[PDB]
Amino acid sequence: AGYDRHITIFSPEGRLYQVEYAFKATNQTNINSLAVRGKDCTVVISQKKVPDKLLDPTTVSYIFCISRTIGMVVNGPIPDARNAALRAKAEAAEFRYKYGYDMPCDVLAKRMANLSQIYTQRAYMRPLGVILTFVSVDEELGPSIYKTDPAGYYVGYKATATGPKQQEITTNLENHFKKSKIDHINEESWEKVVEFAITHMIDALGTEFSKNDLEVGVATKDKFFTLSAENIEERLVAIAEQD
Amino acid sequence: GYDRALSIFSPDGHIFQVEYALEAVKRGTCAVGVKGKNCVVLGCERRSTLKLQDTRITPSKVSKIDSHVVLSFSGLNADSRILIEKARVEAQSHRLTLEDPVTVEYLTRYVAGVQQRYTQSGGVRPFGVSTLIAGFDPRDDEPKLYQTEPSGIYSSWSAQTIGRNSKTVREFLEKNYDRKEPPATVEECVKLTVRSLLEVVQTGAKNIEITVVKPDSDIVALSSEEINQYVTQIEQEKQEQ
Amino acid sequence: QFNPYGDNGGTILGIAGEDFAVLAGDTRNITDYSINSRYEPKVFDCGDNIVMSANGFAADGDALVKRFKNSVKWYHFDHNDKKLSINSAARNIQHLLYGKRFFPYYVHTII
Amino acid sequence: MTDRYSFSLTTFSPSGKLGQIDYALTAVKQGVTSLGIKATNGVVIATEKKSSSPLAMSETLSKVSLLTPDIGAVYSGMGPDYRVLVDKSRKVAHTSYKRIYGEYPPTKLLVSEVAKIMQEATQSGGVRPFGVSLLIAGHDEFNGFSLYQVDPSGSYFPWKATAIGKGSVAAKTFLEKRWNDELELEDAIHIALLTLKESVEGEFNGDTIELAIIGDENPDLLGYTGIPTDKGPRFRKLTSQEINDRLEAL
Amino acid sequence: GTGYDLSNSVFSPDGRNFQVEYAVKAVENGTTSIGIKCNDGVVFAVEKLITSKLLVPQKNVKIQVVDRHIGCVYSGLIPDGRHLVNRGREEAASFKKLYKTPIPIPAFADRLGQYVQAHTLYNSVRPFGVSTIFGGVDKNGAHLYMLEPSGSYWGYKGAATGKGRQSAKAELEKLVDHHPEGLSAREAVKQAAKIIYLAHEDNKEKDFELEISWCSLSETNGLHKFVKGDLLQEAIDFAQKEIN
Amino acid sequence: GSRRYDSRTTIFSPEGRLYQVEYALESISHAGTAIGIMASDGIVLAAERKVTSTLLEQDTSTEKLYKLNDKIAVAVAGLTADAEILINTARIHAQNYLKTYNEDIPVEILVRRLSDIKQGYTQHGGLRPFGVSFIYAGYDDRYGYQLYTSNPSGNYTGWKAISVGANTSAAQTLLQMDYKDDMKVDDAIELALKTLSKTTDSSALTYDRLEFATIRKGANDGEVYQKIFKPQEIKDILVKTGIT
Amino acid sequence: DRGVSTFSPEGRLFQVEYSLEAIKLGSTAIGIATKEGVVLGVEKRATSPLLESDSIEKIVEIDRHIGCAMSGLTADARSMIEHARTAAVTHNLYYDEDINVESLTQSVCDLALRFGEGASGEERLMSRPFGVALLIAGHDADDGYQLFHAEPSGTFYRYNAKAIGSGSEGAQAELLNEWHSSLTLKEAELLVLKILKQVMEEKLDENNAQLSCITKQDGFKIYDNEKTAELIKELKEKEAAE
Amino acid sequence: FRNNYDGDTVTFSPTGRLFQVEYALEAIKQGSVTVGLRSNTHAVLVALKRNADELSSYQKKIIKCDEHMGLSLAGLAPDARVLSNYLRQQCNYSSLVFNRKLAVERAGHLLCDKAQKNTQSYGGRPYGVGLLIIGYDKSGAHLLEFQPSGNVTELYGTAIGARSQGAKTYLERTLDTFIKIDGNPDELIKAGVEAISQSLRDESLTVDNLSIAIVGKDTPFTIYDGEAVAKYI
Amino acid sequence: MDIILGIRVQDSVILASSKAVTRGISVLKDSDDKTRQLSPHTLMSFAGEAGDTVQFAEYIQANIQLYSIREDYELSPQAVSSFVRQELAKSIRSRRPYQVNVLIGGYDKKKNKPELYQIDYLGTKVELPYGAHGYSGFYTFSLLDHHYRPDMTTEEGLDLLKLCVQELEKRMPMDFKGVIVKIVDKDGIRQVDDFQAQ
């Protein structure tokens, strides 16, 4: 009876505790990330925290290059994040091979969400304790953000945030869009969109960032790439000369 | 894929699932078998939890495995069907490969094997059935009567009973069956059988069926009357005293 | 097309004396009209006082002799080092050969 | 590895209840309300787009899905479960019917297929029942229009009109008052909009509401011309604008 | 309620996988081992507790090679370590067979990562009872890595695990600060021998045997080799000297 | 492991009963009542629709009476979805038989096969049994009109009149009270309705809450005909029999 | 619950130990090995007078030079006997000779631990251990007459004499004092007959007990009732003689 | 505690222990004592055979795996049979395919890995037997100790089984001595028998109770039982 | 091939089958009964490939006897023939098909009429007044087409067959060593032990 809390079967309230607890695991890294859409680019920001001095900072990342065009940032333990990344890359490659074109961001999202829905229904598979945020500049849809959770749920966003202080970032972004009345950052250069991203990250979290406190990914027509500590510093310098 | 060990040993050395299988047999309607000098008779009692049945079509308690062998049982009906089908199939296979029908002991050893196997295979429970198998070996006139149980154990009896109140009727048989002089007649054999059932059936002309098996595939079931007549002559033996 | 068989020539001879036995064989190994070796042993001591030779297609002969020696080894392992009698080896060899009844060891064997 | 869960996760309790089916139904109860109304010349199914965040793009999430060009579905309960049920439904319509008879399945049969998929998750080893109830609306030549409900157990029943989820009890009651066998499609849509208003707490417009109908053939939605016998799909999702236009006449 | 720690892939209410955590305990209870990344290679060293005089010295080797350019050492349940290396070996052979070039350290690390992470996905398997420090040289540099029973791993400047991991980590952090320009393979070997002697204090009760291996572009040609004879003794002394 | 979560749906109780079967039967006992009455010139199948609404479409509905063959039909009591699974395999078995022997399948043969399938879920597989009980009404040229019943256990029996589902005790007593061997289809139809009428847990017995079917050998023909009454047809017979 | 191949804190396999308990409840079986052959005797123990005692087969032939007696859940021994007969016949087909008694025994014991719900070692498909122990007796040119005790644990021991079943602790104690390297086949027979009589609940006669032996000359033979009855009489007389 | 974490090998206890493995290790301790020691020319196995009744035989404890390798067991005999049989095949494979005798060190690695698979998966059970492997290969004499946990170690000598600690302390003391008994088997054997008697208590090693095995430079692994061991009692 | 003939008269079906079994250069047997009783009122004759012939016959026999026991009923001749046709129709598309041709003669106790079924190895079944397999039809069908009458008595049928066999013994190259004749009627199956000179 009390095992309705160990495997993914319904509880008398029709709840799936394991899926809920998997959600808890997503905040284990105490990292926050956010994504916004530019006029023709998509940006994803994510705090970078390297506590141990013995670690090689260059190998600590929660952002992944899934395909030439799809980027994915993960909120949750790194081992589950890497499991998701590998699967997503394989799915992305297979899709291109079978259907002749690049797998769209929203389709890859749905695919990963479906895989998640299954760990939710089959008892031998545990959910992955992560939230996946996919971004790209789709050839049909333009800048895109689609995010999936341990429940198998997914949807598109004008912008979104994930992590412990998710709510503060979300309301911050919400307010901005209530004001601008449009669903994206009306900027022509991704550099400025990245800057907007970081600026609001700071406002909402009430924290300052050095070049090694962040991690950035940018999606543009036919390409997704991550910035370097230096590309970032140049970004931080610019926002500084405004405040 | 399902292969859970359902039949396992418990600390005292018992296999409860086989043990409980027997309890299902105790709950089944009584069955009896007695071998005469030139025949074997099988008797079964008919429940009465519900009465308004169609006797023509409702499955009977005695089943022919082949033209010279029959099988009766006590326990789960659905389970007995599985054993009967396998037995009938094995009977034809034996005739096809050995060019001779099965002996009663062979057919018995086969059913018992199937039962034993279901006590130590993963993912399955033992048969909640016990059987009485009787008939005559090909070209032989010596009567045969065997009994099998959930564990897979089997042996031959001069007379035996299984099912509810079998305890009672066995006693009757133990102090009413002389190996020295077995019912030298089809008639006196059928009588001894009816008598043993009356010890537990409590007046049941339509609650008592009998089948007589003679050498060379001579098998026939009695009708209500034929049996009812035996009952009548028996109640007098009592009153006439 | 590919032919899985070949012929390495050679001739072997076995004679049983009253209380002894010999198994002889030339040491020439050939292929068509060429000599592969003037000395390539073809008769082997397989233990338990048994000598064996599988003549014909050398690759098959080697495989068989090798399989038999291994059989003697396991016979010891499985039957408390009991000695493999010549008659028992013979029956064992029959099964080794018949195992490939539909893709035979192209050899004439003598022990 | 290897799924070693080859036994049922849904079994009978002493009272005779099937726990997991029950619990699944409870999950359905907490779900957003959805309904369906059958008219003389069409069927309408609708639900509320409960956007989980204003940053989310509610259009990128359809609760009303096309199964075949003449059949649609909507649900109440667990969205992810619904999504995969729809993929499986669309596929089974092909593998078990179109690839055999060269035509799409009639509503009841496809419903029968979905129901089977659901019943199996109630008895097969290692799984839990689906936490959803579907409302499937469609049309086929020999049966006309129809509306069906499929529950977690796999049971399904035809309806003239019904509602599932959160405020199903109240909504069903309101539908019993307004329904009659002479309703025209527009009437059903109107009744549908009214019924849905009682269930919606916040904003109520064409962007927070999702509604589709099964009506006449839309040759304009076929994509090609040349085959007289191919007239177009009867399924059509209403546009945000089409909804608001009807909300003014509320 | 409770019982969340009885089955392997189960999330506890706080989102943890207790069995993985218990695996870690097996790791902390093991011998200490380390890894040091130098300017053109990596060095691996481990503590070998001498249970008795009966153990033939130098015979029970713990460090293992994968392919020809990778070294792996681990603390915890030794058998689990071998199991993980056998896999790494198949993983490396597969990669070479298909791509011709020997497997890159990052690629190799993930192969081990996915496999270990895999053992935290089902209750039909148990997590790995070891933390593994491994690495080598490839097309673009040296790389050092440490892999936890959770499947978690990162690239390191220096790394340690087991009984005396704290001592070791402490010593490693010093080196990192006092050598921003990078240690040399030759130096790292000595430094490594020291760190191990020091960290042996958390087990000073039993006598031990030192084992070191390295992979340096200049010292070993980018191939993994065991430190033996003179170079080994020289490092033993360097340690024995600085332990007083 | 997994063993922990296995309910073990196929074991005996200390008393020698099958838990799941007994519980499935308990489930069946809350299902709409279904009745079967066999007459000299035909058979009647009647069933009460459990739960109903004004909006439920009754013309396009069928939850209790299903055609298996052109000569065999069943009344269902229990989980509809489970029933459909069994119904479909039953329909296939009938066709296989027909194709093999070029003769319609004898009624008992089909009933035994279906019961055997049920029996299986009772002895192996570790799956829950089907929460279904069937009343079979069929005809063949060896036994003519027949009436059978099968439940979760996989056991089946023949009857002159029988019921499954809710209040069978009450229904059986009423049938055993007014049934007579020389009955006629029309007599039987009336007995069936009367019986349901007195056992309903509902206010009155209306047509919208019933399903009716008969298997008769229409004198003006010579063949067997199955008639699954239509809403209006039930409404009619309801008035005639004096229940309005 | 708990795996069927779980170790107890003492280092024992629960199922195997519980198996041994069932064997204790079985009918008694005794074996005596002499340089003149090996005797094997068992307690029929019918459960009712109506049961035809001769249909109780607790002593079976494996091959002409090997016989065996069982004790415990006897139905579990059928597949063991079958495997044994097949191993012996198969060996002969492959090697044109008799299978050594020890070899035959080791083969049977190989089935022993082949149980579990998925033990990583091969494909041991058998839900539980056997609930019967066996006494395998025979003769072969290399080790002469032999008696082996094969248990569901997989281990087998060679004995000069051995008793298994309900009256084993008692009977074994007896065998300890009665056995010596020069017993004759006849002495062994009377001896087995005597111990069975001491531990059997019933009064031993030619119907509730059965004897058999295996000799190089005539192989495995089961003594018909008449033959044993006389041996019974001969025993009563020698006992009453002092 | 323990009770909730010792139901199967796939479960770690809160302290990082594997109880099923430990319980298996216990079966070894309950096993009859056996000893192993080597010089630079030979390796010897001395095992105390245990008997059931005084009417039973003393169960064999030494198994030959190849002409240059063999082992002694302590614990579940069937498990020793399985493991030794796997070793026989591995040795055999090495010979047939590479025409190479299998290195004792390699055999140790193979045994370790075979045992490990039965400690990380559900359904199986750890092996409940300890093994002492000796052999003479291309690098001389060797002695290995195999534990069901999968841990295999190379030593100059050791002992396992009940009261094995006696013989082990003796050898750890006699080390410098026997390790130099090169070219003289009888001396190495006597040394082994002296170590094993350091674990006696019940009785004294008799003729049908003592079991010895040796392998070396020009000595194929061979077993001595009974009369053949008399000259050592 | 062997001679396999069958004729359906008023109240019975008669099957005549050659007795020779030739293997290569020699006639190994001249008393072979190429028939199997499938049930008390159904008989099947067969001809074809050496081993397949009897293996198939006995396989069918086993199946019918099993059905009889399970149902305590005797399948109609038509039912038995359909079962046999299906078995052959499966076999024809299998790895190694049964090369067997059969005649199934049965008396239907329900219809009270004899029936004769001809089925070749491909599963080609047809019901007829008379039939044969192989070359047999080539020599005899002209005689049967002439003298056959639906109301013939068993005695008339035997006389017509005798005529057919005589034509076969005159024009056919092979010596089939006569035929064994069997009658199937309301009372079962019996063999005409006197046809060597009837």
What is the helix (H) or strand (E) element at residue E85, kind and residue range?
A: helix E78-99
Between C and H, how many CB-CB pairs are < 8 A?
6
**Cα distance between residue C39 and residue D2, in whole Å:** 57
A226: tokens are 């991550």
Q: Is A212 exposed, middle or buried (0-12, 13-18, 19+ CB in 10 A)?
A: middle
Chain F residues whose beta carbon lies within 8 Å of the beta carbon of residue E123: 1-2
- Cβ of D20 within 8 Å of Cβ of A10? The answer is yes
G17: nearest Cα among E220, A197, A119, H27:
H27
CATH of the domain at A225: 3.60.20.10
**Cα distance between residue C83 and residue C75, in whole Å:** 8
Q: E30 near E130, Cβ under 8 Å?
A: yes
Residues paired with B146 in a beta bridge: B133, B156
Residues paired with B213 in a beta bridge: B40, B219
- How long a stretch of residues is chain B? 241
In chain G, what are the domains? 1-242 (3.60.20.10)
CB within 8 Å of H12: residues ≥ 6 apart: E19, E22, E23, E25, E26, E126, E127, E129, H5, H18
For residue I57, the chain B residue with the least C-alpha distance is: B96
| Nearest-by-Cβ selection for G157 from H56, H78, H123 | H56
CATH of the domain at E76: 3.60.20.10
Q: Give the SS3 label for residue G15.
A: helix
CB within 8 Å of F155: residues ≥ 6 apart: B76, B77, B78, F115, F119
**Cα distance between residue E41 and residue F48, in whole Å:** 83
**Cα distance between residue D63 and residue D209, in whole Å:** 10
**Cα distance between residue F223 and residue B153, in whole Å:** 52
Q: What is the 3-state secondary structure (H, E, C) of chain F?
A: CCHHHCCCCCCECCCCCEHHHHHHHHHHCCCCCEEEEEECCEEEEEEECCCCCCCECCCCCCCCEEECCCCEEEEEEECHHHHHHHHHHHHHHHHHHHHHHCCCCCHHHHHHHHHHHHHHCCCECCCCCCCEEEEEEEEECCCEEEEEEECCCCCEEEECEEEECCCHHHHHHHHHHHCCCCCCHHHHHHHHHHHHHHHCCCCCCCHHHEEEEEEECCCCCCCCEEEECCHHHHHHHHHHCCCC
**What is the CATH number that goes with domain I1-198?**
3.60.20.10
| H77 and G CB contact within 8 Å | yes
**Using CA of residue H177, residue H183, residue H185, residue H186, what is the dihedral sign?**
negative
F10: tokens are 């196929």
**Cα distance between residue E12 and residue A21, in whole Å:** 7
Residue F67 neighbours by CB distance under 10 Å: 15
For residue F1, the chain G residue with the least C-alpha distance is: G3
| E124 and F CB contact within 8 Å | yes
**What is the CATH number that goes with domain H1-233?**
3.60.20.10
Residue I186 neighbours by CB distance under 10 Å: 13
Q: C84 near C32, Cβ under 8 Å?
A: no
Q: Report the residue numbers after which chain G has a gap, meaning the C atom sits over 2.5 angstroms from the next written residue's N, or none.
A: none
Pairing of strands B208-214, B159-162: unpaired
**Cα distance between residue F50 and residue H137, in whole Å:** 82
| Separation in Å, CA of H13 to nearest CA in chain G | 14
Chain A residues whose beta carbon lies within 8 Å of the beta carbon of residue D129: 10
| Separation in Å, CA of D127 to nearest CA in chain E | 15
First-to-final CA distance of chain F:
62
Q: G136 near G148, Cβ under 8 Å?
A: yes
CATH of the domain at D52: 3.60.20.10
Between A and F, how many CB-CB pairs are < 8 A?
8
Q: A63 near A215, Cβ under 8 Å?
A: yes
Q: G83 near G63, Cβ under 8 Å?
A: no
Pairing of strands H69-75, H62-66: antiparallel
Q: H191 near H199, Cβ under 8 Å?
A: no
Instruction: Compute CA distances B66 → B40, B87, G229, whole Å.
Output: 15, 9, 39
Domain count, chain D: 1
**Cα distance between residue I44 and residue H78, in whole Å:** 58
Q: Give the SS3 label for residue H106.
A: helix
| A124 and E CB contact within 8 Å | yes
Give the range of the structural domain holding residue A159, as residue numbers without chain letter: 1-243
| D105 and F CB contact within 8 Å | no
Q: Give the SS3 label for residue A176.
A: helix
Give the range of the structural domain holding residue E61, as residue numbers without chain letter: 1-244
CA dihedral A20, A22, A24, A29 (to 10 degrees): -170
G and A touching (3 or more beta-carbon pairs closer than 8 Å): no
Domain count, chain E: 1
Amino acid occupying residue E28: E
| F208 and D CB contact within 8 Å | no
What distance lies between CA H26 and its chain's CA centroid? 15
First-to-final CA distance of chain A:
59
| F8 and A CB contact within 8 Å | no
E31 catalytic per annotation: yes
Q: Is E98 left (phi over 0), alpha (psi -120 to 50) or beta?
A: alpha
**Cα distance between residue B201 and residue B29, in whole Å:** 10
Residues paired with E43 in a beta bridge: E36, E214
Q: H58 near H83, Cβ under 8 Å?
A: no
Q: Give the SS3 label for residue I127.
A: strand
E75: tokens are 């603390």
| Nearest-by-Cβ selection for B6 from F8, F16, F158 | F8
Residue E170 neighbours by CB distance under 10 Å: 14
Q: Give the SS3 label for residue B71.
A: strand
**Cα distance between residue G130 and residue F173, in whole Å:** 51
Tell me the backbone φ, ψ of residue A56, rounded to 5 degrees.
-95, 95
| Nearest-by-Cβ selection for F27 from D10, D16, D157 | D16
Q: Give the SS3 label for residue A12.
A: coil
Q: Structural domain boundaries of chain H?
A: 1-233
CA dihedral D137, D138, D142, D144 (to 10 degrees): 70
**Using CA of residue H221, residue H222, residue H223, residue H226, what is the dihedral sign?**
negative
Residue F19 neighbours by CB distance under 10 Å: 18
Q: Is C11 exposed, middle or buried (0-12, 13-18, 19+ CB in 10 A)?
A: exposed
Instruction: Detail the DSSP E strand segments found in chain G.
Output: 29-34, 37-43, 59-63, 66-72, 132-140, 144-150, 156-158, 161-164, 209-215, 219-222
For residue E123, the chain D residue with the least C-alpha distance is: D1
